[PDB]
C-alpha cells in the first residue's frame, strides 16, 4: 500500500532538513508505537540520515532503531516506485524531472503525471492552463489527441 507520510515530511528524504528528521521521528513514534526517542539524537539533515547503517540507528535508539531503519527503507522504496510510475506515463522524462514533478505535487503520482502533460500541451497554443487542462481531461489525458485538437484549433 502507501504510507501516510506527514505533509511537512512528504519531501524526499534526500531533501530533509534537521527539523524534517525530527518531525519524522515524532511521527514514526506515535504512528508505529515505537519507544520514546530523544530528538537530541539524529541531529542531522536527510543527507546524513540516508548514509546511516542499521547499526547506527540502533546506537541512537536501542529499542526502536531497527524499526526506524526499516521505515526509512520502506519510504525510499516507495519514492523510487512513484518515480518509476511517472516515467511510465510520460515517456522521455528524466529521473530528476520526475522527482521534481512529484515534489511539486506533494508526492502525488497522478497529479505529477497530469502536470507534466499539461506543461507540454500548454506551450502548443495561447490557451490558458484551465483550457489546456480541460482539453486533456476530456481526452482522458491522451496528450497526442489533445495536441491534435490544439493544433487543429489554434
Ligand atoms: Na516529455
From Swiss-Prot:
The cellular location(s) given in this protein's UniProt record come to:
Cytoplasm; Membrane
Tissue expression from the record: Expressed in all umbilical cord blood, bone marrow and adult blood cell sub-populations and in several leukemia cell lines. Highly expressed in fetal blood, brain, lung, liver and kidney. Detected at lower levels in adult prostate, testis, ovary, small intestine and colon. Not expressed in adult lung, liver, kidney or brain.
Top-level taxonomic group: Eukaryota
Processing and modification events after translation: Autophosphorylated on tyrosine residues.
Q: What does this protein do?
A: Involved in negative regulation of cell growth. Has tumor suppressor properties. Plays a negative regulatory role in the Ras-MAPK pathway. May function in signaling pathways utilized broadly during fetal development and more selectively in adult tissues and in cells of the lymphohematopoietic system. Could specifically be involved in phospholipid signal transduction.
Q: Which family does it belong to?
A: Belongs to the protein kinase superfamily. Tyr protein kinase family.
Subunit text: Interacts with the SH3 domain of PLCG1 via its Pro-rich domain.
Q: What is this protein called?
A: Non-receptor tyrosine-protein kinase TNK1
> What organism is the protein native to?
Homo sapiens
Taxonomic lineage from the root: Eukaryota, Metazoa, Chordata, Craniata, Vertebrata
Tell me what gene encodes this: TNK1
Q: Please specify the portion of the entire protein covered by the chain, as first and last position out of its full length.
A: 590 to 666 of 666
